[PDB]
Structures are given as C-alpha cells and as structure tokens.
C-alpha cells in the first residue's frame, strides 16, 4: 500500500534528496523561480537583470532552452574523485554545490574560454568550407 501526494514537488523540498531524484522536478523549480511603487520598481529591474544574467550564460554555453545540457568540458577528478553513482545516487544538491563551490568560476571559465571559443571558431571554418 502506498500513499501519494498530488502531482509534484511543491517548492525546493527535493534540495535535500539525492540529485538524481531531485532532477525530476527541474521543470517545476525553474518555472517557479524564473517567473512603494519605486521600491518595487527597483526590485523589478533587479529581477530582470538576474533573469537575463542566467540567460546570457545559458545562451553562450549552448544550453539555452534546456534545463539539462551536456557540455564538452572533461571533469577534472581533482575537483572530486567520486564516481557517477557515488554522487548522483548518494548526494543532495545542497551538499554537492558546497563540495565544488570553489570550482564554480573555474569550470564556468573553462566552458567559455575553451569550448565556446572552439565551437565558434570551428563553426565558421566549417561553414566556409
């Protein structure tokens, strides 16, 4: 016998479950987050800038339109030597982000400086010839 909730994750609750299980509701969480007068006016502009900031990076990385996209940057096991299953079936999003917090800027840089650079250079060369 199994008791069930209604439809899907309410809000953020999956943050403490494994990243594997949590991935199920990225569509939910993303939609919810993505979407006196002067103070609110300021807040609105800030919300837009935060919104567009993320969209800029997703655009550049070739990830726009996706909530899950594979890159072409290899994982340097110096960051973490855990296997695929040792991470995804054993660690939460809150825990994972902390584990590699100090590599965020490194990897983000690598995506753009190496892969994006390559994809744009080679793209033109392929279109030319």
């Amino acid at each position, epitope marked *: 016998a199994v008791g069930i909730g209604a*439809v899907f994750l309410g809000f953020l609750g999956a943050a403490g479950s494994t990243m594997g*299980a949590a991935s199920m509701t990225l569509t939910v969480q993303a939609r919810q987050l993505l979407s006196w007068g002067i103070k609110q006016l300021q807040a609105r502009v800030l919300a837009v800038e935060r919104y567009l900031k993320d969209q800029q990076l997703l655009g550049i990385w070739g990830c726009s339109g996706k909530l899950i996209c594979c890159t072409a940057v290899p994982w340097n096991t110096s960051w973490s030597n855990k296997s695929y299953n040792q991470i995804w079936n054993n660690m939460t999003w809150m825990e994972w982000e902390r584990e590699i917090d100090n590599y965020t800027s490194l990897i983000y840089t690598l995506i753009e400086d190496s892969q994006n650079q390559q994809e744009k250079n080679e793209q033109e060369l392929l279109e030319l010839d």
Partner: antibody
Amino acid sequence: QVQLVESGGGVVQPGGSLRLSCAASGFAFKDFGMHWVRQAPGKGLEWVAVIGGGHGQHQSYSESVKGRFAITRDNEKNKLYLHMDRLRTEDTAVYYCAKDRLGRPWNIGGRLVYYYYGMDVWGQGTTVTVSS
Amino acid sequence: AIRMTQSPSSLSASVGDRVTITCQASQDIKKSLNWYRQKPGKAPELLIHDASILQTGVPSAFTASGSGTHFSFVINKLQPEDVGTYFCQEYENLQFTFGPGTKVEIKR
C-alpha cells in the same frame, strides 16, 4: 532498546473524548511511519489508521473511525497521538501504536509517496472504555 | 483492501502434528500478506511477511506460501508454546485489513 510506552487510556462516557499518547524510543521515530490498531474484547484486530514518516504528509483512516478520530505526531517528543473524539460505546477497545516496516516519503515520479508494508513493531496498548 | 477469509475458525491438533491455516482473498492481492500470532496478554507477533519470508529472529518453525487469492500458513510442528490466534492481514491498499484470525490449540 525499542520500547513503546502507551498510555492516556481510562474510562470515558459516550460523547466524551480523550487523547492517547504513545511515547517511543530505540528507533528513528521521526523517520518511520506509524500505525494505529485496536482490538475490542472478543474480537480480532481492527486497523484504525496510518500516518507517514517525516512530518506525516499523508494519512488514511478506516471507514469505521473516519471523521471521529485524528492522527498526529510530535517528532521532538517522540510521541504518537490519537485524538479520540465524540466517542461511542462501540469504540471500546485496547488501542495499540505500531511502526510500519517502512513508511518513508520517497521522492519518486516528482512527488513524495509513502511506502507501507505493514506493522512490525508495537507495544501492548492501553484499554479505552466507552460506557455509561 | 480486499476482504480476507480464514478457515477453520477453530483448529486443533496434538503436540508435534503439522497444522495449517487456510486463508483466501476474494480478489487478487498478488503477495501483500503478513502472518501474525497472538498469545493471551500479548500483541500479535509478526512471524511471516510478504507471504513467505520469516521475520528476523523468528525460528524456522513456520512456513507460508501461495499467491494471488490462495494462501496458507504452515506450523511445522504444533507445540504448546505455539498456541495462539494467527491472523492473515492484507496490506495492498491503505486499509491494511485483518482477517478473522484462526485459533490454534492443543487437543485434550
């Protein structure tokens, strides 16, 4: 070790009320789902209700008790409660608290669900008499 | 949960005999069956779960089998210590219905 201390019973009149409180230790009370069952004198064991683990985001009641009883829990006191309201003489029974084999809020299909496989841990209950 | 029935309501044998309890569902419950044993003054003891697997710490004095609608509980040898009421519980749906219970005792 595992021990359930089940009290709060006694004798009440029909139309009255009481609340039972089953204190427990020796296990992760906060995590496992729990059961209520009762056995009237001369009868077999009747299932009363179930509450899931964690904060108890799901319940089910026997049709014989729905609307008259409520289940809750306090994960810091490690106590399981049965709110026995608007009682009838038919509610005379020894009531037991029990732990399900699992009862956990699994994240599956994008939602939490509680998997139950039946009671496997309990105390000896306490007698609640409703009479006049 | 599907209503369970047990038979005979009164089952007895001499000490050491092989004693079985019939239990059936009116509808297919596939496997969701627990066996409990109640002794006077004690809450029912879980002996077998998932229709065939002994609970940890329970001696191999009992077996059970069947699936679908037809199940049985087997007492390999009935000892005075095994006297009690055995219950057939279904937990397929969130009603966890108990069967009537069968009383097993020693002939005299």
